Design a protein around this nucleic acid. Structure first.
Length: 848
DNA sequence: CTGCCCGC
RNA sequence: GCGGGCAG
C-alpha cells in the first residue's frame, strides 16, 4: 500500500498525474507523483422507446472496438435519472454504461458526439468528459486529502517529475480516499521579485529574487504570528553593468539577513533560481501579485533567456516549452504558466481570492495589506533600478535588496495571518474540485463540482460541458446590510431544484411555478440545508469554545460554509454555467424581488430610508449620528427581516459614519473599524470614482482623496467647502508654476488591441504615444500599458511617454490647462455635484 | 464571467 | 457596433 496526501494534478498524454506528499518510515514527508492509467470516460447510452441496454451493447460495442482498436470494452446496464435542460430525455431510464478508456491505440483524440442517433439509443452522456473530472467523480475524491494507493509501480516511471518519488498505477480503482482529517506539513516558499523596465523592448527584466523558506507549515494547527523562516536567500544581478562593485558581498553579509548570492547576468541568476527551487521542492509558492504580474514575468524571462531547467517552477519535468508559448496571446500564455506550475500551489495574497479575505483593504498594495492585517507599519521604498545610483552605490543597492527581503517576509506573514491556505482548502473539500482552482479565483469552478458530486452520488446523469440610489451626501450613519444569502434561502424555502421544478425545456423563457408542498425535498435544496445546519453546529460550538486556536479555526470553517452556500445560485443563474437553467434563475429572481420589496417596506416601516439596494446588499440610513444608536437600529432591522423570512439571515456588513453616494457602485464613505478594545476608528473607502481609474493621475487621486476627507469631515459644511476651495487655489498655483513632481502627472492606459489597429486612435493620446515609440525604436505590442504625460497643437499630439518626459533636459513640462481642467476640475465637479452650497463658479474661478 | 457606466 | 473601464 502507498499513502499520499494529494495537493494538485495535471493532464498529459491522456493520463492523469497527481502531485502530493508521502510519509516515509521516519515519518518524513517528501514530494511524489502518481501517474494514473486505465482511466475511462463513463458514457451513458439512452435507449429508444422499446429498447434495452443489451440492444445498444450489441450494436455500438463492436463498432467501438474497431474505431478505437480495443480487444474488449467493459460495459453494463445501469439505471440512471436525468432532470436537466435537455428536452425529450426522460426522468429515469435504463442506460448502457460504456467504460471507454482515454488511452486508445487508435483515434484517442476523437470524441463521440452527444447526438449519436441509432435505432437502439438516441443520446449519449459523458462523451467529452475531462480526465481529472472523471477520476475525481468516479472515485468520490473531495479535494485535497489522504489517498490509499495500492499496486504502485516504483520501477515504471523514471525522470518524469521534480519529485522525490515517482510511481504509476495500472488502474484508477487502485486509489481510494481515506477519512483522515489531518494533513501533512507543507513546504512553503515566499517569493519576492524586483524587476527593471527596458524601454527598448518594453520588457520587464528581473534584477533580484528573494526566497524565504518555511518548511513546516501545519494547517492542522494555527500558524504562530511573525513565524521565523528556516532559510532566507537573495539572488541578484547587476541592473546596469556586467559586474557589481567590490565589497558588496562583504557589506551584504554585514547588513542583510540570510544568504546573498551575486551573479554576472540575469541568465545565471535564473538558472541558479531553478536549481534552488528544485532542491527546496516547496508544496506552496507564496507571493504578492504572482498570478498576473510577477509569475508571468518570471516565466517569460526563463523563456527569453532559454533557461533549460525552467520546469522546476512546477513539479512536472519538461524539456521544451509549449509550442504556442509566446505567441503574443496574453490570454493563452496564462494557461501555459499555470499548467507548468502544476504540482506546486500558488498562494497569491493579492489575487481575486486573496482580496476577498481582506475587504478592509482598498489598494491591496503589499504595505497596505501588511498594515491592515497585522497592524504593523512599513514604508514602501520605490526602487527604480534604471536610476544610475544603483550601478556604483553599494549602499543604494543594499537598501533596495533589503526592501525586497522585507517584502518577501511580509507576503508570507500576511498569507498566514489571513489564513488563505486553510480557507481555500476547506472550500475545495466542500466543492470537491482542485485546490489549485480555488487558490486561483474562478466562478464556474467550485460551483460546478459541488453539483457534479452531489448529483453523481445520487445516481443522476450530469450535463456535458434594485433600488435607484439616493445621490448625495449622507450625514447620518449608513449601514450596509448583506443579502448574499438571499438566493440560497429562497432555493431552500421554496424547494427549488432541477428535480422539483416542472419547467418547459423547449421554451427556457417560460416562467415555471414553484413546486407544491407535496413534492419531496429536492437535491439542490437538501444540499443547501446540510450546509446551513453544519454552519449552525459550528457557531454553537463557538459560543462555548474557549481555546483561541480552536475558536479561530471554527470561524474559518463557518466562513467556508457560508461562501459555498452563497455561490450555489451562480450554478443555475449565470448563463455560461454547466448547470444553467433560465426558468430556475427567473423563478428565484422574482421571489427575490418580492422579498426585497417587502424589505423596502420594512425599512420604511422603521422610518429608515433605503439609500441604495440590490440583490447582494441594501444600504440603509439609520438617521443616527452615533455608532451605538446606529448599531441598535441595524440589529432591529436584521431581526425584523428574519421574522418575515425565517430562513433569510441578513447581517451588518459595513458601517459608514458618512456616505457620499454618486451612483450604483460609485461612492466615497467613512467606514468604522472597531479594534480589539472596542475602540472605534474611521477610514476612507472609495468605489467606482474617477479617483480609481487608470486614466486619472496620482495628482488627481491626491486631490480627490483630500477633498473627500474634508467633505466627509464632521466640521461645519461651509467651512468644509471653503477649505476645499482654499485647497484647490493652492494646488492651482503649484501646477501653473510646475512645482509638483512629474511622476504625479502620469496617466496609464491599456491597449487591448495593436496600437495600429484603432479607428479613432488619432485622437487617443495613449495610441499616439505608442506609435511614436515604434518609430523611435521602442517595442510596443497589444496588451501593453502606456504611461504618458500631456505636455505644453493638439492634446493627443502633446502627449509623450512618461520616461521621455522624466528627462529634465527635454524641456517637456506638463500642460497646466489640461491637468487643472480635465484632471482636477471635472473630477471635483462630479464629486461635489450634489452637495449643498456647492458652486461650480467658485471652483472654476479657483482654477480658471 | 456578467452587467454597467464612460467615450467616438 | 467598436473601444475604454469600473464593480461583485
Amino acid at each position: 500500500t502507498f499513502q499520499m496526501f494529494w495537493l494538485d494534478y495535471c493532464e498529459v498524454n491522456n493520463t492523469l498525474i497527481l502531485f502530493g506528499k508521502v510519509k516515509l518510515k521516519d515519518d518524513n514527508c517528501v514530494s511524489a507523483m502518481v501517474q494514473i492509467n486505465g482511466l475511462c470516460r463513463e458514457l451513458f447510452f439512452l435507449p429508444r422507446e422499446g429498447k434495452t441496454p443489451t440492444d445498444i451493447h450489441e450494436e455500438i460495442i463492436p463498432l467501438l472496438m474497431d474505431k478505437y482498436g480495443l480487444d474488449n470494452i467493459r460495459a453494463k446496464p445501469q439505471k440512471m435519472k436525468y432532470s436537466f435542460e435537455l428536452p425529450d430525455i426522460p426522468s429515469e431510464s435504463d442506460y448502457l454504461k460504456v467504460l471507454l478508456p482515454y488511452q486508445t491505440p487508435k483515434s484517442s483524440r476523437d470524441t463521440i458526439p452527444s447526438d449519436l442517433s441509432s435505432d437502439t439509443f438516441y443520446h449519449v452522456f459523458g462523451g467529452n468528459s475531462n480526465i481529472f473530472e472523471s477520476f475525481v467523480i468516479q472515485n468520490r475524491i473531495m479535494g485535497p486529502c489522504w489517498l490509499d494507493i495500492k499496486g504502485a509501480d516504483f520501477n515504471s516511471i523514471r525522470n518524469a517529475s521534480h519529485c522525490a518519488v515517482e510511481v504509476s498505477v495500472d488502474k484508477p480503482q487502485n486509489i481510494t480516499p481515506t477519512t483522515t482529517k489531518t494533513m501533512p506539513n507543507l513546504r512553503c516558499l515566499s517569493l519576492s521579485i524586483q524587476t527593471l523596465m527596458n524601454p527598448k523592448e518594453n520588457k520587464q527584466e528581473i534584477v533580484s529574487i528573494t526566497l524565504s523558506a518555511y518548511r513546516n507549515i501545519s494547517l492542522d494547527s494555527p500558524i504562530p504570528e511573525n513565524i521565523k523562516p528556516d532559510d532566507l536567500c537573495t539572488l541578484v544581478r547587476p541592473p546596469q553593468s556586467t559586474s557589481f562593485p567590490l565589497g558588496l558581498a562583504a557589506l551584504a553579509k554585514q547588513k542583510l539577513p540570510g544568504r546573498v548570492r551575486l551573479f554576472n547576468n540575469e541568465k545565471a541568476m535564473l538558472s541558479c533560481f531553478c536549481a534552488m527551487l528544485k532542491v527546496e521542492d516547496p508544496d506552496v509558492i507564496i507571493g504578492h501579485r504572482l498570478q498576473n504580474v510577477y509569475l508571468d514575468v518570471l516565466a517569460h524571462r526563463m523563456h527569453d533567456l532559454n533557461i533549460p531547467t525552467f520546469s522546476s517552477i512546477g513539479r512536472r519535468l519538461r524539456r521544451t516549452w509549449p509550442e504556442k508559448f509566446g505567441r503574443g496571446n496574453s490570454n493563452m500564455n496564462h494557461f501555459f504558466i499555470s499548467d507548468i506550475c502544476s504540482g506546486r500551489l500558488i498562494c497569491d495574497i493579492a489575487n481575486e481570492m486573496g482580496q476577498s479575505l481582506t475587504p478592509k483593504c482598498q489598494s491591496w498594495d503589499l504595505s497596505e495589506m501588511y498594515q491592515v492585517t497585522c497592524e504593523k507599519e512599513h514604508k514602501p521604498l520605490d526602487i527604480d533600478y534604471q536610476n544610475p545610483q544603483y550601478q556604483n552605490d553599494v549602499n543604494s543597492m543594499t537598501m533596495a535588496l533589503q526592501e525586497n527581503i522585507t517584502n518577501c517576509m511580509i507576503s508570507a506573514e500576511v498569507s498566514y495571518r489571513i489564513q488563505l491556505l486553510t480557507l481555500t482548502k476547506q472550500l475545495t473539500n466542500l466543492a470537491g474540485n482542485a485546490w489549485a482552482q480555488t487558490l486561483g479565483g474562478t466562478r464556474a469552478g467550485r460551483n460546478e463540482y459541488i453539483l457534479l458530486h452531489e448529483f453523481s452520488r445520487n445516481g443522476f446523469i450530469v450535463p456535458d460541458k434594485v433600488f435607484e440610489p439616493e445621490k448625495g451626501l449622507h450625514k447620518n450613519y449608513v449601514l450596509v446590510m448583506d443579502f448574499n444569502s438571499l438566493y440560497p434561502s429562497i432555493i431552500q424555502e421554496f424547494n427549488i431544484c432541477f428535480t422539483t421544478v416542472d419547467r418547459n425545456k423547449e421554451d427556457i423563457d417560460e416562467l415555471p411555478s414553484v413546486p407544491p408542498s407535496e413534492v419531496d425535498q429536492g437535491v439542490l435544496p437538501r444540499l443547501l440545508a446540510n450546509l446551513v445546519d453544519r454552519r449552525r453546529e459550528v457557531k454553537k460550538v463557538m459560543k462555548t469554545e474557549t481555546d483561541p486556536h480552536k475558536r479561530v479555526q471554527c470561524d474559518i470553517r463557518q466562513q467556508a460554509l457560508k461562501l459555498t452556500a452563497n455561490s450555489m445560485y451562480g450554478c443555475l443563474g449565470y448563463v455560461n454555467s454547466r448547470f444553467y437553467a433560465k426558468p430556475l434563475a427567473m423563478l428565484v429572481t422574482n421571489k427575490g424581488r418580492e422579498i426585497l420589496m417587502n424589505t423596502r417596506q420594512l425599512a420604511e416601516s422603521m422610518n429608515l430610508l433605503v439609500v441604495y439596494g440590490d440583490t447582494d446588499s441594501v444600504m440603509i440610513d439609520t438617521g443616527c449620528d452615533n455608532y451605538a444608536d446606529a448599531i441598535k437600529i441595524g440589529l432591529g432591522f436584521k431581526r425584523l427581516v428574519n421574522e418575515r423570512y425565517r430562513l433569510l439571515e441578513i447581517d451588518i456588513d459595513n458601517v459608514f459614519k458618512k456616505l457620499l453616494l454618486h451612483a450604483k457602485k460609485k461612492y466615497a464613505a467613512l467606514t468604522v473599524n472597531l479594534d480589539k478594545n472596542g475602540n472605534g476608528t474611521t477610514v476612507l473607502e472609495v468605489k467606482g470614482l474617477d479617483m480609481k481609474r487608470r486614466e486619472f493621475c496620482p495628482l488627481s487621486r491626491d486631490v480627490s482623496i483630500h477633498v473627500l476627507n474634508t467633505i466627509l469631515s464632521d466640521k461645519d459644511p461651509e467651512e468644509a467647502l471653503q477649505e476645499v476651495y482654499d485647497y484647490l487655489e493652492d494646488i492651482r498655483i503649484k501646477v501653473e508654476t510646475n512645482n509638483i513632481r512629474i511622476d504625479k502627472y502620469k496617466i496609464n492606459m491599456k491597449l487591448s488591441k495593436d496600437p495600429k489597429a484603432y479607428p479613432g486612435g488619432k485622437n487617443m493620446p495613449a495610441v499616439q504615444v505608442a506609435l511614436r515609440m515604434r518609430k523611435a525604436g521602442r517595442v510596443v505590442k497589444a496588451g501593453s500599458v502606456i504611461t504618458f504625460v500631456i505636455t505644453k497643437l493638439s492634446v493627443a499630439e502633446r502627449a509623450h511617454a512618461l520616461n521621455e518626459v522624466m528627462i529634465k533636459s527635454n524641456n517637456l513640462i506638463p500642460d497646466p490647462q489640461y491637468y487643472l481642467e480635465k484632471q482636477i476640475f471635472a473630477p471635483v465637479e462630479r464629486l461635489l455635484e450634489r452637495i449643498d452650497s456647492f458652486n461650480v463658479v467658485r471652483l472654476s474661478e479657483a482654477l480658471g
